[PDB]
Amino acid sequence: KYDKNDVILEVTAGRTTGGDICQQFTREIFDMYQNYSCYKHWQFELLNYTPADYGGLHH
RNA sequence: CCUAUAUUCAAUUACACAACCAUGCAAGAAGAGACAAGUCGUAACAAGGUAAGCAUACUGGAAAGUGUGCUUGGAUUACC
Ligand SMILES: [K+]
Ligand SMILES: [K+]
Ligand SMILES: [Mg+2]
Ligand SMILES: [Mg+2]
Ligand SMILES: [Mg+2]
Ligand SMILES: [Mg+2]
Ligand SMILES: [Mg+2]
Ligand SMILES: [Mg+2]
Ligand SMILES: [Mg+2]
Ligand SMILES: [Mg+2]
Ligand SMILES: [Mg+2]
Ligand SMILES: [Mg+2]
Ligand SMILES: [Mg+2]
């Protein structure tokens, strides 16, 4: 079923450790899927992008 | 009633009678604790950058802010 509906991918910053170790890691995997979409010839549409203070992605 | 002995007895009345408390459930309200790292600010510990704090009053998103009196669980480094 489905497989022909646009899918929204949401990434956040896990709350398990202090610092930016989790926030910085969020940026890397977010760009992983963005480059992956080009490999699969998909279409990427940015909806929300909130950078963190210490060079990261809050959500 | 010349030895002797037989028989009966009841429940009513005036008024109170779920107030009351226990247990269980509930439309819903409020508090406390928890890890965790999110948003907002930096109150406290150094004269914490306005010395802190108690009683009480008033005020503000939030720590708290300010007045009056009191405490040193602050200092004035000591022929200055
Ligand atoms: K103060
Ligand atoms: K002090
Ligand atoms: Mg922290
Ligand atoms: Mg000073
Ligand atoms: Mg301070
Ligand atoms: Mg200040
Ligand atoms: Mg102060
Ligand atoms: Mg004071
Ligand atoms: Mg007071
Ligand atoms: Mg004032
Ligand atoms: Mg005062
Ligand atoms: Mg004034
Ligand atoms: Mg001395």
UniProtKB/Swiss-Prot annotation:
Location in the cell: Mitochondrion
Signal peptide residue numbers: none
PTM comment text: Methylation of glutamine in the GGQ triplet by HEMK1 is conserved from bacteria to mammals.
Superkingdom to which the source organism belongs: Eukaryota
Its job: Mitochondrial peptide chain release factor that directs the termination of translation in response to the peptide chain non-canonical stop codons AGG and AGA. Non-canonical termination codons AGG and AGA are found at the end of MT-CO1/COX1 and MT-ND6/ND6 open reading frames, respectively.
Domain notes: The GGQ domain interacts with the peptidyltransferase center (PTC) of the large ribosomal subunit to trigger nascent chain hydrolysis.
Similarity annotation: Belongs to the prokaryotic/mitochondrial release factor family.
Protein name: Peptide chain release factor 1, mitochondrial
Organism of provenance: Homo sapiens
Biological classification of the source: Eukaryota, Metazoa, Chordata, Craniata, Vertebrata
